[PDB]
Each structure stands twice: as C-alpha cells, then as structure tokens.
Structure 1
Amino acid sequence: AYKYPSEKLFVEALKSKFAGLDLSDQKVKYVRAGYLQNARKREFQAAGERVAEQRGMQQYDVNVHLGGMTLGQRQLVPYKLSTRPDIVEGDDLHYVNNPAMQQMWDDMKRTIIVGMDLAHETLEKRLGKEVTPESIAGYMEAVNHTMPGAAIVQEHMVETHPGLVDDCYVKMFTGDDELADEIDSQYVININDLFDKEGQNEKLKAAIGKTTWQAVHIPTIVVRCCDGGNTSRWSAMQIGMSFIAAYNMCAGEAAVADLAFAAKHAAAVQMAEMLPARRARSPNEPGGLSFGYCADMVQTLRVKPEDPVWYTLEVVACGTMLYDQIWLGSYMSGGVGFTQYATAAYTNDVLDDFTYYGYDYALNKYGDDGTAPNDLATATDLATEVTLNGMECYEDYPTLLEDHFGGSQRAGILAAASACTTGIATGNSQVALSAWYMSMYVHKEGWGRLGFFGYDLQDQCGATNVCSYQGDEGCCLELRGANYPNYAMNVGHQGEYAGFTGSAHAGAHDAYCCNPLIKVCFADPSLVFDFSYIRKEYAKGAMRTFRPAGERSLVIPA
C-alpha cells in the first residue's frame, strides 16, 4: 500500500514559482512593481482600453484600485493544477474565464435521468402495445433526432440548427445485460466496459436491477439561454414525441399524458431539487445538489479505485469549483468572486500532501482502507494529527502559508485533509464529518484565527449537528447538500464535504456513494467534460485548450 515520501508533495510547485528560493526564509524583498509585472494583468488593461473605446464608456482600469496602488505591490504568483504540469495565471481559473469549468456545470445542469419501465407499462396497459428490442431501437433513433430540437410528427416545423445543439443526446442503460446487448451500442451506456475494475459493474447492475433508464443531456445552449429547470421539461417533451412516433400512438391521447407525468415526475431523477424563497431557484441548480450526487458524478473512482485519495481529491476539485466559484461566487453573490477560495483545494499539490500524509498515518496506525473504528475517538485522533501536521507545514514553509494567504483557505484544506483521511480510514462519511469540525476547532486555538468573518457559522454549529437526529439538524452527509441549513451561505465547505463523502466510499471500496443511476450516467464519455479527471480539464480551460458546447459562431457575424 501507499508510502508517504520524504519530500513534501507541495515542494515542486514552490520551486517552480520561486526558482532558487530558500524555502525556509521568512522575509522577502518587496519591489512594489504593480500590475506591469504580470502578463495577464497587462493583457486585461489593454482589453479594457479596447472595451472603453468601442462602447464610449470607461470599464476595466487597474488604476481605479483604491489607495493609489495597482494590484501587484507584492509578487503576483501563478498556480499549478495539482497532479498536472500546467502552471497558469490565477485569472485563468476564474470560472468566467475558464470554459472547462463552465462546461462541467452545464453538463451537470443539462442532465436528467428518466426511467422507461413506467412508460413501457403504460403502452402495454392502455394501448396493448408490445415493447421489444426492436421497438426500443426505433424509439432510441427517434429520441436522438428529436431531443436536440427536431421534428418527427407535424408538418411545416422549424428546427434547431443541428450544429448549435451537437452536444445533445440520449443514451439508455440497464442492469439487464440481455437488453443492453440487443440495442445498437451507440445508444447504450456500457456499464460492463466502463466499470470493469473491482467488480464495480456487478455492484451497479445489482443496485439498478432489471430496470431501464435514459440519460438525457439537453443542449448546452438551451440551459445557457434559460435555466436548469428547463432540463426535465425539455427531456420530457421530446421523450413524449418519440414515444408517439415509435409506438404509432395518437399524437395526443390520454395515454400520452401518462407518459408526460412519468417523464416529468414519476420516473424522473433530477440532479437537484428546488430551493426556499430567499434563494429561489429552479431544479437542477447547485444549491440543490447533494454531496452524494456530486461525488457520484466524478468518475476517477472507476479508473483507479486502488488509490482512494486521487478520486477523493478530484471530487474536491469538482465540488469546490462548482460550489464556491460558480454557486456561491456567482449565483449567490458575484463580481470578482471566489476563485482562490476554491483554488486552494485543487492547486499546488497542497491538499494532496496533507491528505496523503494522513492516509499513510492511518494505514500504519489503524490498517487498510475502510477498517478503522467508526467512532468519535478515531475521528479525533486522525483529525488532530492531520491538522497539526498541516499547520506545521504552513509554519515551516513560509511560501506555502503565502499561497493559502486567507485563513478560510487554510481551514478548508486542513479540515478536508482531516476528514478525507478519516473517511478513507473508517469508510464512514458521518464519522469523517466529526473529524472535519474537529480540525476547525484545533486550528482556531493554534493560531487564534480561522477563516473570514462568517466562516465558521457551520463550524460552530458543526460538531453538535453531526449526530443530531432533530428535523432540520439531523441528516446523513450523503443527503446533505448546499441547502442543508447550516451550509446554505458560506465558502470553503461544500465542495470539501462532497470530497470526503467520496472518500468514505472510496475507503470502503464501493462503486458509488448515493445513487447508482447518477454514477452510470456521468461515466459516459460522450459528455463534453471529462468527469474522470477534473483537474486535467481545469488545466485545459485555463490554458485556453478546452472546447465548450453552446457557442453561436454559426449564426453571428464577424
């Protein structure tokens, strides 16, 4: 099993940022260069000059920064994507500037999973139709013509440009191998091929049963014009059209409404449910996304289950970006936003170092993945050791502390390392959650500081609500999400929670955390974003080498 090395995992990035620097030195010379030190800020300044000239109105200007100083009175440092060679400027990781991050969220939002059994039962019961591999095959062709916005029944219909909706498609999947084998493989998610490791395919098929599902991905351009609430409705409309065609129904009879109810509600599995009024949102938005579902969308677990830390930290990268940068930093606020609150969790190999250290500590003290006692005492031991080690790293390497310059970043990374260690060791998300809050409490007393003004609302509520069973307090971590009351507001937590939810099921060597339908749906390589290697995709977006869906070049001038 894993052996933690003698060189800290974060040293490479420090050397690549500071060629020749003695990493123990606590002082540095400040040259106060301002923005001209940095190619990206200079490019932005020039871009703002063009913007203002073109529109007749001042826009971006570094000199508007207060105090007569521009950004960069200290050194502005770049970011290495963890486990990647790519080093990028920090602005390259802002979600607005990074099409890989935008497409990951669009791929989530435009997805709905819809059962077929209820629809087939309706056709049998009400119409006396026989459902066969051949009728299903005809349906799958119909729905992949209609779903992107094309016509199958009426005359003189106008349609979406197929090139604007090239990312839209429907595949079916099922625990019934006999049926999966009778359908043209272009229309099927092959569970057996995608989940060949550690018997994962047989776990998924047993959890799904001999039931049939559709993974529907509506066009990116549609959710960009509209919202996540569009997804289940759009899916259902074209599912309905396709059943009408494929089973020679009346194009609008009572039985069609039964198919609609099944597709919209009774057999529909949303990515996320709606939110209360204060933060009113349609379904399929990030506030409604549970940590179990988020963890199950990430696919590193099917690639290398033998290294539970890698998948865990890919989940952290997925969740922290989505929940902090896009959800909290835009949907719930906006502006410059919260890029580096999240980058701390997926750059410069910092969390990796702290977490592999913990993994090795647990392996040697408690035993293999998932075997540690599921109790408060164990959470206490692992969280304290992992937090103290990480604090010592920040204390011993001044440029590491300077990287995670905000206490909120340090708190989330120290606590994520602690909870991910505990989850992998114990295989229990809820015990890991006790470890998360322990880390916060240990951290606060060491340095007399933790995060921003409002960082530990959930953390002071935290320990007592891990094992509450009261109505609005108690909840297992897999089913908590960004609308769990204590979690509804603040950066530096939600994506980390997803991460160590994944860590507990990785430690237990499970095939998924919360819903096998989600797991299979997002394993499909036909999605635009590669859910199996999050941080590699983020690097592509930051380097302007990621091609997203939803652009309108086909229908605009130049």
Structure 2
Amino acid sequence: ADKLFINALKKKFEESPEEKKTTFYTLGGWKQSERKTEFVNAGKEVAAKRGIPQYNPDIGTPLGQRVLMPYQVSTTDTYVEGDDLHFVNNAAMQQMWDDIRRTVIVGLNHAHAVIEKRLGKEVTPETITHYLETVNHAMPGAAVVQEHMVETHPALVADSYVKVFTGNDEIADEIDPAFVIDINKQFPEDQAETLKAEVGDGIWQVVRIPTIVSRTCDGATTSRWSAMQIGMSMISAYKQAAGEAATGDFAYAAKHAEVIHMGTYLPVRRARGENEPGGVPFGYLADICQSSRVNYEDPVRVSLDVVATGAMLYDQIWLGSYMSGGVGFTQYATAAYTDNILDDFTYFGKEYVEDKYGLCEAPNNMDTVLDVATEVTFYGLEQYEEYPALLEDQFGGSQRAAVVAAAAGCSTAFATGNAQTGLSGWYLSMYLHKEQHSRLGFYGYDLQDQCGASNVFSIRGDEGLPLELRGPNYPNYAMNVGHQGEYAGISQAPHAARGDAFVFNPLVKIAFADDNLVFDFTNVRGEFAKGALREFEPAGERALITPA
C-alpha cells in the first residue's frame, strides 16, 4: 500500500511522514538518547580510570538539537540507534570482515598431479579423506611430524578449518561429508547444475584460518598460513620425505599456481597485501553474499543484500577505517540498508521494468538507459519531496544520491541483463539528480560520477573494464563513499534477474555456501541487526587466556 519506508518514518518521529514542520532545541540534547547517555557515563569512567580526559559531550558542538533517530534495519523489525551500526560497536560487522579476510580457496589439482607424476603415488577419495582429517588437525595450528612442538590452544582457534568441493558428485560422495561443501544441498537445482558444470572434476579446498590470527596480523597472512599447513598435511598424509624437492612444488601450487585470494594487493599509496577490502572486486563481493541461493525468486532482495554487504564493508570498514578513521562513515552506509528506503525505490524500478519490458528483455542500449534510469531517478527524488520525514532521515546529499542511483542502476540492469548499461544508468541518475536539486553529494562525491559516463564503455588501459571486474582499486573509485557497495549491487542485479548462480567467480560463490562460517552470509542485514542488539557471538576472543 504504503511506501515500504513508511513504518520506519512513523517510528522515528511524532509527526506523520508528510508533515513539513517540527520542533527543535527542546529535546534535551544528548539526554534524549539512551545510547549517548551510556557513552557519557562511560566516558567519565574511562577518563577517571586512565587519568586522561576522553569522551565529553561538552567538547565542540552540542549533539541532539534535532531528534536523534532510530534506524530500522531493512527487511527486519529491529530498530536501533545509529551508534549500534558503527562497525566498532557491532561484532557482526567485524566478524563478516574477519570471515572474508581469513578465507582462501586452494586447488588440489596441481598437488594431486605432483603426487602421482613426481612421487609416483596414488590419490584416491580415501587418501583425500585422510589428508583432510590431517589438515583439520594441522590448520588451526597443531603439529603432525616433529617432536617437542608447541601448539595453539584448540579453543582459541575453533573457527579454523578446511573443507573441499567438487563438481563430481560421486567423488564428493566418497569423501567424509564433514569435510564437504555439498553443492546439491546448498543450492537450488538449476544453480547447482551450473556450479557443478563450472567446477567439473576439479577439487578445491576452502581454507579458513583463525580469526584471532587474522586480527593479530593481516589479510596477507591467510594464503601463507593456509599453504604452510597444507604443506605439512601433504607430507604427513602422502609419506614424502619431510622436506624434499617435491615439497617445493606443493608450496608453489598452494601459494601461487592454484590459489584464489579474496582480494589482490594494492598500489603503494594505499599499500596493502592480499585479502584486504580494497582488493575485493565487486563481482567477488556479490558472490560472497549468499542471498542468491536462498532468495532466487526475488532479484531485488538478492541485489539489495549485496548492497548491504558492500556498503558496510567498503564504506564503514574500508573507506571509513582502513582509508581514514575516526567517527567514520556509518550513516553514509546505513542509508543503503536501513528503513526499507532503497528497497522501495528498487521494487518500484523492478515493477516498472517488469511491466514495460519484462526482466532481461529490454534492448541493451542507451535508449533503455535513458528510459529506465530517468524514470527511477524521478521516482526516488519525488519521494524525498513528498515526504519531509524521509528527507530529514537521509539528510546528507551523498546518501540520497547513492540510494537513488543504486535503484536506477539496478533497475536498468534488470531490464538489459547487462551490468555495464546498469552502470551507465547509475551515472545518468547522478546528472539528473544534480540538476533537479542543484546539489548532489559532499565536496568530492562525484569525481567518479563526472568521469563516469565516458569511462563506462571506454576500452583504454586504466579505464576500460566490465563492472564485475571493477572494484575499490579501479582508479576513479579508489577514494569516495557512497559508490562501492552500490556498484556491487549493480553487478549482482542483471545476474539476479537472469537467475545466474554467480556473478564473477563460481568458486567464491561455493566457498561461502558454508554453514560452519561464523557470520551468516544468507542473511546479511539480519546479522547486522543481531550485532546491533549485542546478541552476535564473534570468534577470536581472548577470554580463555585472560583473567576472570
């Protein structure tokens, strides 16, 4: 009936969403908020304990002259203060990143060829199972060969393990199911058929190293840690000399020749090793999100779960901490996953496309871009004009620009079945938005959006790239909030509409279809809400080795 955001707006304000006027200044400042009151009290205790002033509401300007809003986490009935969605205050958000950072995919195909060709030994579903029992002892940090080894405490590293998957059902059947990511169990029939065809008779490990290690160290640790314990377990299970020439072949295969990192390394100005957020391409992020395999009948839900995944990771943790820090960028991101606002805009666009073209049935050209992106942009902007509560909610121009353009781009991609024309729609939305309201985002919001139109279909060296392959290190995109997570959504959009099992990498898609992960990637926004309520239990805590 209502727009999907009406309940949220009603929960925020005393006024009806349509009302143009309100009352300020008499709300008690920070005292209106349970959370800010908790912070003020905490700041006093912290300062006293350590002998240095810390949090103090009297420093600078006085928060809370307007209503400090609750936010509904989209698709949930959970309403929380915005502070509960700051990544520092939300264990679910921290664990989502840890679960990606500590994952690598490592093939066994080169390794098995070394065993059979160089060593002259046999590989069977039986030897593989033995290897897997060995590596699941070894991977968390325990010994298999040497005498007088000291080891990691198993309870501190309980979240570390190794599983395998293959497209060959019979071989998968022969391996102990405790070690197997069952593609036929986790995916719907047509999707499972596609993924098994992509993988074929290949056998791949999904390695997850301990969260406590990932937090002590960095992302570039993951593929190295993985390789060391794969190496030990190959020695143990296949009876090599513990350190012969063939051992080097296994190292090179596991570290280089058949490894899939979640993120590639970054240039010097933003120097980082592998498996950091900036190296994760938009296509991978879409495939890490598991909404595709549970919500496949709803392409909007799938696309917007990917937007939530990316907005949090790319804006809050990556741009808001790795690349800057401080108070950071919580609400730049929450705009994309709260109050069912982006949902309303994107369901509108989906229905528009569905009624006019049919999904994936529009011509893949500029005519379609001009049609869909313009229509959806005008809808979104009209909602801010008709509902003053909505405009006061998403108060920053950057936040409105991202949300409107995300709906416009996803909807264009719903029509064409192609992410590149979806991207063209995103940029057109920005241009129309700017002229309509004589504003867009913050000072430097549209660096990429002004370069945008010309670089969508460019083929030049550092300009030309399918959107799925782009990411936070694509030059235009390397700096600014309110884009990266939304691009991940646009990457997902045409594939969700087409019913594709994956966006860019099928191995990555399968790798996170794993019930033994700590974070539930099938319900990203549900997890964010759980973290906001302080009900999420992360891995990597040191409680076992510290005083009571």
> What is the aligned partner in structure 1 of residue 290 from structure 2?
299
* Greater alpha carbon shift after TM alignment, 259-268 vs 425-434: 425-434
Q: Which string of whole-angstrom CA distances, capped at 9 and with x for unpartnered residues, describes residues 321-379 of structure 1? A: 00000000000000000000000000000000000011111111111x22221111101
> What is the aligned partner in structure 1 of residue 270 from structure 2?
279
Q: Is the 8 A contact 2:399 2:482 kept in 1?
A: yes
Match among 319, 339, 342 for residue 330 of structure 2: 339
Paired residue type of 1:52 = A
> What is the aligned partner in structure 2 of residue 132 from structure 1?
124
> What is the aligned partner in structure 1 of residue 36 from structure 2?
41
- Report matched runs for 1:367-406 at 5 Å: 367=358, 369-406=359-396
Match among 474, 480, 494 for residue 470 of structure 2: 480
Aligned counterparts of 2:464 and 2:140: Cα–Cα separation in 1: 42
Match among 80, 86, 99 for residue 78 of structure 2: 86
> What is the aligned partner in structure 2 of residue 184 from structure 1?
176
Please state if 1:116 is matched with 2:108: yes
TM-score, with structure 1 as normaliser? 0.97
> What is the aligned partner in structure 2 of residue 29 from structure 1?
23
- Report matched runs for 1:404-553 at 5 Å: 404-553=394-543
State the number of aligned residues.
547
Aligned counterparts of 2:99 and 2:230: Cα–Cα separation in 1: 19
Q: Is the 8 A contact 1:412 1:492 kept in 2?
A: yes
Paired residue type of 2:66 = R
Q: Which string of whole-angstrom CA distances, capped at 9 and with x for unpartnered residues, describes residues 479-518 of structure 1? A: 0000000000000000000011011110111000000000
Paired residue type of 1:261 = Y
Please state if 1:227 is matched with 2:221: no
- Report matched runs for 1:163-182 at 5 Å: 163-182=155-174
Aligned counterparts of 1:245 and 1:374: Cα–Cα separation in 2: 55
Q: Percent identity?
A: 63
Aligned counterparts of 2:398 and 2:135: Cα–Cα separation in 1: 47
Aligned counterparts of 2:490 and 2:200: Cα–Cα separation in 1: 28
Q: Is the 8 A contact 2:10 2:16 kept in 1?
A: no
After TM superposition, give the deviation of residue 32 of structure 1 in Å. Answer: 4.7
Q: Is the 8 A contact 1:33 1:74 kept in 2?
A: no
- Secondary structure (helix, strand or coil) at the match of 1:173 reads strand
Paired residue type of 2:480 = N
> What is the aligned partner in structure 1 of residue 141 from structure 2?
149
Q: Which string of whole-angstrom CA distances, capped at 9 and with x for unpartnered residues, describes residues 139-188 of structure 1? A: 00000000000011111111111111111010000011111000010000
Q: Which string of whole-angstrom CA distances, capped at 9 and with x for unpartnered residues, describes residues 285-330 of structure 1? A: 0111100000000111101211100010000000000000000000
Paired residue type of 1:35 = W
Aligned counterparts of 2:340 and 2:46: Cα–Cα separation in 1: 37
Q: Is the 8 A contact 1:424 1:507 kept in 2?
A: yes
Alignment gaps of 5+ in structure 2: none
Q: Is the 8 A contact 1:419 1:436 kept in 2?
A: yes
> What is the aligned partner in structure 2 of residue 53 from structure 1?
48
Deviating beyond 2 angstroms after TM superposition, the runs of 4 or more aligned structure 1 residues are none
Paired residue type of 2:518 = V
- Report matched runs for 1:197-216 at 5 Å: 197=189, 199-216=190-207
Aligned counterparts of 1:37 and 1:534: Cα–Cα separation in 2: 30
Aligned counterparts of 1:22 and 1:283: Cα–Cα separation in 2: 49
Aligned counterparts of 2:366 and 2:500: Cα–Cα separation in 1: 23
Q: Is the 8 A contact 1:65 1:71 kept in 2?
A: no
Paired residue type of 1:296 = D
Please state if 1:10 is matched with 2:1: no
Paired residue type of 2:285 = C
> What is the aligned partner in structure 2 of residue 321 from structure 1?
312
User: What is the RMSD of the two structures over their aligned residues, measured on CA atoms?
Assistant: 0.8
After TM superposition, give the deviation of residue 65 of structure 1 in Å. Answer: 2.2
Aligned counterparts of 2:241 and 2:18: Cα–Cα separation in 1: 77
Aligned counterparts of 2:16 and 2:86: Cα–Cα separation in 1: 30
Q: Is the 8 A contact 2:311 2:336 kept in 1?
A: yes
After TM superposition, give the deviation of residue 396 of structure 1 in Å. Answer: 0.5
> What is the aligned partner in structure 1 of residue 339 from structure 2?
348
Aligned counterparts of 1:23 and 1:437: Cα–Cα separation in 2: 29
- Secondary structure (helix, strand or coil) at the match of 1:214 reads strand
Q: Is the 8 A contact 1:236 1:264 kept in 2?
A: yes
Alignment gaps of 5+ in structure 1: 1-5
Q: Is the 8 A contact 1:426 1:507 kept in 2?
A: no
Aligned counterparts of 1:422 and 1:108: Cα–Cα separation in 2: 30
Paired residue type of 1:48 = G
After TM superposition, give the deviation of residue 423 of structure 1 in Å. Answer: 1.5
> What is the aligned partner in structure 2 of residue 73 from structure 1?
65
Aligned counterparts of 1:347 and 1:22: Cα–Cα separation in 2: 19
> What is the aligned partner in structure 2 of residue 3 from structure 1?
none
Aligned counterparts of 1:133 and 1:299: Cα–Cα separation in 2: 28
After TM superposition, give the deviation of residue 195 of structure 1 in Å. Answer: 0.7
- Secondary structure (helix, strand or coil) at the match of 1:215 reads strand
Match among 301, 309, 312 for residue 303 of structure 2: 312
Paired residue type of 1:46 = N
> What is the aligned partner in structure 1 of residue 251 from structure 2?
260
- Secondary structure (helix, strand or coil) at the match of 1:216 reads strand
Aligned counterparts of 1:32 and 1:532: Cα–Cα separation in 2: 40
> What is the aligned partner in structure 1 of residue 354 from structure 2?
363
Q: Which string of whole-angstrom CA distances, capped at 9 and with x for unpartnered residues, describes residues 438-497 of structure 1? A: 000010000000000000000000000000000000000000000000000000000000
Paired residue type of 1:191 = I
- Secondary structure (helix, strand or coil) at the match of 1:468 reads coil
Paired residue type of 1:24 = E
Q: Is the 8 A contact 2:289 2:306 kept in 1?
A: yes
Aligned counterparts of 1:506 and 1:32: Cα–Cα separation in 2: 45
